[PDB]
Amino acid sequence: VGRALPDVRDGLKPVHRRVLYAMNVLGNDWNKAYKKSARVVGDVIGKYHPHGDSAVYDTIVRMAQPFSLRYMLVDGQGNFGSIDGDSAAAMRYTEIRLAKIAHELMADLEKETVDFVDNYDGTEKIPDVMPTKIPNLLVNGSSGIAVGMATNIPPHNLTEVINGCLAYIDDEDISIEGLMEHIPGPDFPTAAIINGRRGIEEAYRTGRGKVYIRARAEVEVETIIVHEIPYQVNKARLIEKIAELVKEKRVEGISALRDESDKDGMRIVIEGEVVLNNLYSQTQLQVSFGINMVALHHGQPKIMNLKDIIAAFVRHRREVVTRRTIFELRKARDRAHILEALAVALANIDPIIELIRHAPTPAEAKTALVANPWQLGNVAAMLEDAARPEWLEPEFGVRDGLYYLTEQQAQAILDLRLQKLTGLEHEKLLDEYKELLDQIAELLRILGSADRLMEVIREELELVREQFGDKRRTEIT
Amino acid sequence: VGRALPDVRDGLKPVHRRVLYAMNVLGNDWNKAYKKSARVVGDVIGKYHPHGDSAVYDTIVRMAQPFSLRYMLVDGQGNFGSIDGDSAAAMRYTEIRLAKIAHELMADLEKETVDFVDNYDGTEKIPDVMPTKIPNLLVNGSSGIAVGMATNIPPHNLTEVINGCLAYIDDEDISIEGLMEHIPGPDFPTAAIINGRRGIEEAYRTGRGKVYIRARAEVEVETIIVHEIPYQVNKARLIEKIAELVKEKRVEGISALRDESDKDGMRIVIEGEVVLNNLYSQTQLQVSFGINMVALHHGQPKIMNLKDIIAAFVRHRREVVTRRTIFELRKARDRAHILEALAVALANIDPIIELIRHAPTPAEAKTALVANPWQLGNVAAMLEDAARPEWLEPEFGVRDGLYYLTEQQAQAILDLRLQKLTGLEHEKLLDEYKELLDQIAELLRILGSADRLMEVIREELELVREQFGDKRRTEIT
Incomplete structure (x- = not known):
């Protein structure tokens, strides 16, 4: 079906x-x-x-x-x-x-x-x-x-x-x-x-209509050379069609038939114009196309x-x-959200590291991270909304000058690679964040x-x- | 071939x-x-x-x-x-x-x-x-x-x-x-x-020798029931073989032929013992196996x-x-080597982090890490050889109470995830290291x-x- x-x-x-x-x-x-x-x-x-x-x-x-x-x-x-x-x-x-x-x-x-x-x-x-x-x-x-x-x-x-x-x-x-x-x-x-x-x-x-596709052919002086034929036709089965027609004399009178089709073009050579027209009517040189x-x-x-x-x-x-x-739009919110936690994490690395280095297991470090709100360092002017995910609970994110991490955001911090603490890697997260804000506003501009x-x-x-x-x-x- | x-x-x-x-x-x-x-x-x-x-x-x-x-x-x-x-x-x-x-x-x-x-x-x-x-x-x-x-x-x-x-x-x-x-x-x-x-x-x-495989069959009193046949024989093409033989009377004299082969076992029922023996000689119930x-x-x-x-x-x-x-053995050396750097890295995290947080790019942090030897903290008694890779250059590893990092070992440190700084994750690297030492000695004990x-x-x-x-x-x- x-x-x-x-x-x-x-x-x-x-x-x-x-x-x-x-x-x-x-x-x-x-x-x-x-x-x-x-x-x-x-x-x-x-x-x-x-x-x-x-x-x-x-x-x-x-x-x-x-x-x-x-x-x-x-x-x-x-x-x-x-x-x-x-x-x-x-x-x-x-x-x-x-x-x-x-x-x-x-x-x-x-x-x-x-x-x-x-x-x-x-x-x-x-x-x-x-x-x-x-x-x-x-x-x-x-x-x-x-x-x-x-x-x-x-x-x-x-x-x-x-x-x-x-x-x-x-x-x-x-x-x-x-x-x-x-x-x-x-x-x-x-x-x-x-x-x-x-x-x-x-x-x-x-939606429906029969159309006629014909071959682009011409005579030369004596010889009929077809440069291009109808759509879906087998050139070989066409040369043969003509052949078993000139043999049975169905097609009035033809001399020699030769396929000189090389790589550059196509040449269906057949050796006045009366030959070409009578050819069209009995060969594949012309085909119908019942458009359905x-x-x-x-x-x-x-x-x-x-x-x-x-x-x-x-x-x-x-x-x-x-x-x-x-x-x-959703992808944008979710990334800006992960970026917020990361930005916050790096603005207070010393107290972050201290918590981690003393927490026995990663799960415990995870609890201690979300257990208490975090100070917004230099990222205070960056976070100050629509970049927050439509699924996020209001008890998370910047509420009163402090940041409330989700269980996820804490894992992101925990999965942070040491190299990400360098000067360059830091900016890339902040710049990406700023780009998203421009991007989400644009996508909203579009949806509206x-x-x-x-x-x-x-x-x-x-x-x-x-x-x-x-x-x-x-x-x- | x-x-x-x-x-x-x-x-x-x-x-x-x-x-x-x-x-x-x-x-x-x-x-x-x-x-x-x-x-x-x-x-x-x-x-x-x-x-x-x-x-x-x-x-x-x-x-x-x-x-x-x-x-x-x-x-x-x-x-x-x-x-x-x-x-x-x-x-x-x-x-x-x-x-x-x-x-x-x-x-x-x-x-x-x-x-x-x-x-x-x-x-x-x-x-x-x-x-x-x-x-x-x-x-x-x-x-x-x-x-x-x-x-x-x-x-x-x-x-x-x-x-x-x-x-x-x-x-x-x-x-x-x-x-x-x-x-x-x-x-x-x-x-x-x-x-x-x-x-x-x-x-x-x-290497070569013809053997004879026969079917395990017995008579019951009147009926010859084959429980199991020779290896590689088609049970169907065997019932049929017997059939077109009892029809042509090639096989002395048989009553009814019935294949009662269910899922639990096999039953090629054919309806004294003279029937069974003459059957073996003319049917697939016995096959040769030219062992090559x-x-x-x-x-x-x-x-x-x-x-x-x-x-x-x-x-x-x-x-x-x-x-x-x-x-x-090689896998063992290579891991202990990566562990050495990691152990050393975590024994002096503060000066490690300081270097990273101030190095603009990860490549620069990489240069600063290998640029100068490191102090062996509590890992001094752990590193004090055969755990070092047979490819490692002598200018690397613990030389004089200080550790000389390779370009690789520095990247490992740089790829360290924050969660790995916790109490548990730390021991797992130290314990793994100690296990390898026992393991390499064993593998050497074997190779020798x-x-x-x-x-x-x-x-x-x-x-x-x-x-x-x-x-x-x-x-x-």
Whole structure:
């Protein structure tokens, strides 16, 4: 039910999420060295997706192929296959790492921005979705033909989808037409041209619509050379298709067929223009694409339109940013709280040390520390509120020129390393504290203003379009 | 070459070692909770044996089956198959953990007792062999029919093999006959009886010898009921063998055939004694076992005899214990060294703290600590040698009533946690120090005496026979 359909929010299925999540836990970053695919697969089979290494590896592979993804999620190094059906190399040879943009899908995963469900054995947690900043469903697409739960969302240009997102934000009552002012149609990683423009306008407007993808080919004088073919077509099975058609003479009349596709480009050489047109009608040089935009929305299958899909992303970015803000705020209080005790501890080290050196056990030193309030040394002007945790009891913290330690704050002091008593290490705790105060006020400034919150989302999208946005590939006629 | 043959020392192949090693790294202990097989398999596929999950799982499975191993290496919980060819459950359902005795195979693995080779990607190390205290080759056996590199070593009774080992130790010039005084023959986990006693005496004496394993069966008055069959036979394929023989009338004359094998025991019911004897000669109720004792010795294939195999174990236990002793000794010096600085640091905390609280950075506090010798407080009688590391330079340590700190010892002091300044935490470092002195002298006492070293090995073997030795299964006529 859920394995078949992708989640509108992140555009992935359980597998994809598991694969990428595992890579994230492995510190398998784009800035770090590559890792053997085996390392990741085995980590996934044993912790998230225990369903045969072959399946998982095929997932890792497809996310690495430049002809499968408009914006690859996995940076693969080695034989990951080709447009001619070439199967990838073994997992113990290929090397991979999270693509630059994949980190954007799991950006803030840590900051309690998404819900986490249990894995097969209940020992590990896995995000329900990814706190993505990238509109992955549209951008990379999603296919599948299951029990009534089929989908067929084509890829799109990030720059275009972002502008579409921004537009929606600037005016919620925007039409599908105004939306198409930025997103004219799909954008395939390989494919060259889409003729039927109305199929797009229909697909976007209602979620469904057949479109036609054709190969970018031309004649030269005598010879028809195809530079780029339709999305998802096997170049090999196309040369062969043409071959067994020229043999049976189905295709009027062809001379010699030769695949001169090198590394720099592609060359499907076939030896006037009447040959090319009659070829399109009988070969894979032109393919239909029944756009079926079905995905998991609110934990339920839905035929969503362009706007529905964009609206779904933006609302996710709303939740994420908010949940991130709430976290950063709590994290901020908790640290400033630990810093207060530490600052206080170091302002009266001599009486602190005296208590410790005479207390037999650490537990006893812990009791003596919280047993009586402490004098605020030079930190009197620093502590003089909102930096205190919403869970802290009022009997703790600075009450009347004296500091009342919690049982925890005492342990922090007790865990203090001698080196932290030096001049430098001391300031770092005081400076950090002062930074937090500026930071919490900012996060509150954000949580309060529903405008400042949306302005945070906007800036993120404009940032992704800059560092990740690229040129359009598929041409629309 | 090496995949085909087992290593005389531990009796495992690269796979087995990898599987068990991974379990060890996973803390997948017998005293801890079970883990899903998937967890272990995936850990092995990604770090040690990246050759398909199916293969690895089959390994984990075979080491769990009571009918496959005389002393199981893996404690499996679930459907791990049966004597009727029943395949094990999926890896995501079965639960496993290192068997009590498996820890004995990897006992002291940590103490630099064995060499470590690189894995497929050079990111992980794997032991060349296991620092086993169990004569695994003989005890659990090893089969394989490869390119001229075939082997067929049957299982044995631990108690018996241990006594054999002890005997060898007590008199190196012991004969194969004197050895057979303890190890009369193989001991199968399932199998019931071995007739040909000379085949054993021949196999042990030269490494090769055919033996005959028969089923323990009897008649009842009319019906022949087999309680236990030969080692490695599929009970199902045996019932069927008999069936298609009574059908073709190959087997004189049989009434009804019924497999009443429940959970408590086994019942191959077939409905005088002439039936049973004629059955043995034409069925699997009796099987030959061409004992071929070939294993990896000194990194080379060898047809070893009983003694050669036992001698190989004992010599391994010699190396291991020695290498363990050398490690424990170096570890001991290094700790006492760190303790000396800590003891000295706490005997003059006030001048230590003063230096730290005034030194801006930890690096500067580090320079000031090693810049000048320190007074030995109450620790003057404790430090007053062999506890000093064989690598330490003579310009460090107590030289003339003053202590010269190393750059390291200073960092230890700097990393000291405030809680360590209490009364209790202080003694623990002083007591630990005093214990080490007794310990190093003991380890030296061991390294010096070639008798005390062998006496350590003996005691280990007698210990394994007690806690792991059990009764004999296969009967020898």
